[PDB]
């Protein structure tokens, strides 16, 4: 994995030694070169994971998250270069440094062979995210949002530290490859109950779990566009990655510990989606949609059937692409009206037709239109949870109604109807913005041709 | 109720609006033109019966029970004109009513496609921006203290002035673009 | 009572400016100024080349794989003859004639 | 489809409908005949005139605009303003 970590670190001299007008073009070019290089991780086998060293390996779960992560950096650089154009050159280089450093932490978070190194990188991802939100966020509430984002994650994860060090003392190792073969069944006790909670609640917060999700409609909304892209597209999916790693060590206790949390998700996706029907802030509507979509990933990991893991990792990759594009579309209208009120700018298909078509495609992938990998993940999770209990389809199916309802209302409020009269600074769509939308949507639609690469280690 | 100039509906205006709505809902009930013609003259006779009532209390009472009469006897799906609010073609072409300022954001390769149109548009924008300060100082010298009482706007007073707040009435899009 | 004289004067002035605008929406005879820019080809490019492509794809890539084009076997009647074999199917039993 | 109106055509059709009204003599009617003060018509008659204009040209005049049309010239001007004629 050292053929990826070293170019990501060489992106630091590539942004701090660049000419003052070349610091976006060079970082975009070489980050796209790293993203083209990321395809070598697709050397996956049906039996063995691509095991590099004592420190790094990459199975078919971590590989699509890595390719999405290394792809997301050029898209964040294209997204965040317009509103940081009047910024000081040193703070501009510091912003690019925080994005590069966050990618650097993420690519060795997903390839951590050992779990306490996973913890160190997993909590290392807080600090560039916290600095990006609380420094380049636009409104007043970025400080409070950074506080909530920091202290939900740390309060969930400092018991995870004690739990992982307890596994290191008990089993002898926190290598995942060793613990595939030295896993002991976890019996029923209160000690093993709080063992389970300490191993799970950090990732429950990072997914987020319903009831614990209060950081997210502040952290995703008060962030800048690159912060919202990396928080929605990757940093939620650390929780699903970590749960899929750590429920190896939590059997058969998960079979009766998952019962409340599944309820919290199966009801939570009914609530948060319903919250999306009454959100006046468009960016908050996309945030609660992200909560509603990650509730299915929580359910699928907690029922721990193969169809559920295949659908959950397909839903993670698909929601990363779709939610990143929806935040970028909301930014494309925020850079024209300078407000996030959804009812303010209306009728935008009369003025911006191709950008309305990008809104249309992002809304159709949001509502899981087949054969998108959104629908492949959604459908496979629904199959596995019908196998879990035959009544859950009601909570699934009603969700698939409400998920349609706000996905098109967002399309009807913003793009359709009569245009707002007094708003006259609606510029034509830049080539940069349509490039951003196309680089989100075209990989998402190409993955419908060959979806087996985003279906996880048990395809 | 809700009018831009008047703060209310007078009794005479309420009687006229009830008369128009009664004839329209009756015509919805009375599809054919001769049958509607007969019953519309009968309804005109009913309106011309109590025409000369001088007691405003008694007249308001008669208007109120006539509204009760109408609400009991209205068509459930009345006739609506196509471009009328509730019709089948109402606000249909609002997706083609592009505002004028979008023409300011064209590329020069498509502005040069219409040279006379934009060369004629520049003097519209010129006339607008040199009429603007005169009509603003017209509005702030004629409006009473405490704000304008009604939503009515004054006309132009001089020979050379344009009427105040005129641009989004003159340069509104056509109803069939 | 209709409009006040102020409202009549305003509607006349707005009417004049509106008709000037709508008349100035017309085109010039030179506008638009444009930049300086086989009978059965539809039977060839849209019928026949896709028939070629799809017949090659079915014949040498899809029929070469097992159970991809699975076809219902044709319907054998009493009185038929098999083309691959030549075995004539014997006809039905003689009818109890009804009418 | 949808033949474009003119001011002369709207004027001819408005005065055509008003000549077909038995409470108006077609030898006195001009474009500037006030209905209440020159033709002596009732307010109910003015409402019926506006409704015949609606049935003639195929669109609804609202009540706040119906009550302020007191001559055929203002009716022709209102239909001109709502149909954008002489474009």
């Amino acid at each position: 994995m050292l053929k990826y970590i070293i170019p990501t670190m060489m992106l630091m001299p590539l942004t701090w030694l660049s000419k003052n007008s070349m610091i976006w073009i060079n970082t975009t070019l070489h980050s796209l070169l790293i993203s083209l290089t990321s395809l070598l991780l697709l050397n996956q086998f049906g039996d063995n994971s691509l095991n590099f060293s004592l420190t790094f390996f990459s199975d078919s779960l971590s590989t699509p998250l890595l390719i999405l992560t290394m792809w997301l950096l050029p898209l964040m650089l294209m997204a965040s270069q317009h509103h940081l154009s009047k910024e000081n050159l040193a703070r501009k280089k510091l912003f690019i440094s925080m994005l590069i450093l966050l990618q650097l932490f993420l690519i060795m978070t997903f390839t951590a062979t050992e779990l306490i190194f996973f913890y160190i990188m997993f909590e290392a991802t807080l600090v560039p995210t916290l600095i990006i939100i609380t420094r380049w966020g636009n409104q007043t509430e970025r400080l409070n949002a950074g506080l909530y984002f920091l202290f939900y994650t740390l309060a969930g994860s400092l018991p995870l530290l004690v739990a992982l060090i307890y596994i290191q003392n008990t089993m002898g190792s926190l290598n995942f490859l060793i613990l595939q073969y030295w896993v002991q069944p976890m019996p029923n006790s209160w000690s093993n109950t709080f063992m389970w909670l300490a191993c799970m609640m950090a990732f429950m917060v990072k997914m987020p779990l319903y009831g614990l999700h209060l950081w997210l409609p502040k952290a995703h909304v008060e962030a800048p566009i690159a912060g919202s892209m990396v928080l929605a597209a990757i940093l939620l999916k650390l929780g699903g990655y970590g749960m899929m790693r750590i429920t190896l060590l939590l059997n058969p206790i998960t079979d009766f510990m998952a019962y409340p949390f599944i309820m919290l998700s199966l009801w939570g996706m009914i609530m948060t989606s319903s919250i999306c029907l009454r959100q006046t802030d468009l960016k908050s509507l996309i945030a609660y949609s992200s909560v509603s979509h990650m509730a299915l990933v929580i359910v699928a990991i907690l029922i721990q059937t193969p169809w559920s893991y295949m659908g959950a990792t397909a839903l993670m990759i698909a929601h990363g692409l779709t939610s990143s594009m929806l935040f970028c579309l909301a930014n494309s209208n925020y850079e024209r009206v300078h407000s996030r009120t959804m009812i303010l700018a209306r009728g935008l298909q009369t003025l911006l037709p191709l950008m309305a078509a990008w809104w249309l495609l992002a809304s159709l992938t949001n509502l899981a239109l087949p054969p998108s990998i959104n629908l492949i993940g959604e459908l496979f999770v629904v199959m596995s949870t019908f196998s879990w209990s035959n009544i859950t389809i009601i909570l699934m199916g009603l969700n698939m109604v409400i998920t349609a309802l706000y996905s098109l209302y967002m399309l009807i409020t913003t793009q359709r109807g009569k245009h707002t009269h007094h708003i006259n600074n609606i510029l034509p769509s830049f080539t940069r913005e349509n490039a951003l939308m196309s680089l989100h949507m075209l990989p998402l639609l190409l993955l419908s041709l060959n979806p087996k690469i985003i279906l996880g280690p048990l395809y | 109720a809700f009018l831009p100039s008047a703060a209310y509906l007078t009794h005479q205006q309420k009687v006229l609006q009830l008369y128009k709505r009664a004839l329209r809902h009756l015509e919805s009930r009375c599809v054919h033109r001769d049958k509607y013609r007969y019953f519309a003259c009968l309804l005109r006779a009913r309106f011309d019966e109590h025409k000369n009532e001088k007691d405003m209390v008694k007249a308001t009472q008669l208007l109120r029970e006539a509204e009760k009469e109408f609400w009991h006897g209205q068509h459930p799906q009345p006739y609506i004109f196509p471009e009328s609010p509730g019709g089948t073609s109402y606000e249909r072409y609002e997706c083609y009513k592009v505002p004028e300022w979008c023409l300011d954001d064209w590329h020069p390769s498509e502005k040069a496609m219409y040279p006379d149109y934009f060369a004629k548009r520049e003097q519209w924008k010129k006339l607008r921006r040199e009429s603007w300060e005169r009509e603003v100082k017209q509005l702030q010298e004629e409006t009473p203290v405490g704000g304008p009482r009604t939503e009515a706007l004054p006309p132009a007073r001089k020979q050379g002035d344009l009427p105040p707040l005129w641009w989004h009435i003159v340069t509104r899009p056509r109803e069939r673009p | 009572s209709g409009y006040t004289p102020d409202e009549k004067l305003r509607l006349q002035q707005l009417r004049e400016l509106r008709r000037r605008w709508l008349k100035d929406q017309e085109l010039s005879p030179r506008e638009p100024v444009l930049p300086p820019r086989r009978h059965s080809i539809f039977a060839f490019t849209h019928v026949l080349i896709p028939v070629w492509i799809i017949h090659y794809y079915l014949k040498y890539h899809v029929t070469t794989k097992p159970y991809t084009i699975v076809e219902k076997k044709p319907r054998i009647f009493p009185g038929d003859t098999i083309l691959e074999t030549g075995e004539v199917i014997p006809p039905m039993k003689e009818f109890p004639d009804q009418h | 489809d949808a033949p474009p109106l003119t001011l002369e055509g709207i004027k001819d059709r408005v005065l055509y409908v008003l000549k077909l009204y038995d409470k108006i003599d077609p030898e006195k009617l001009s474009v500037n005949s006030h209905f209440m003060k020159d033709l002596g018509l009732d307010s109910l008659d003015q409402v019926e005139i506006i409704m015949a204009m609606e049935d003639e040209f195929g669109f609804e005049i609202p009540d706040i605009d119906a009550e302020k049309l007191m001559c055929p010239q203002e009716i022709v001007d209102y239909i001109a303003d709502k149909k954008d004629v002489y474009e």
Partner: peptide
């Protein structure tokens, strides 16, 4: 013959 200018946004970009 009485061709009218169709106002539309900038489709160049």
């Amino acid at each position: 013959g009485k061709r009218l200018f169709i106002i539309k946004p900038s489709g160049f970009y």
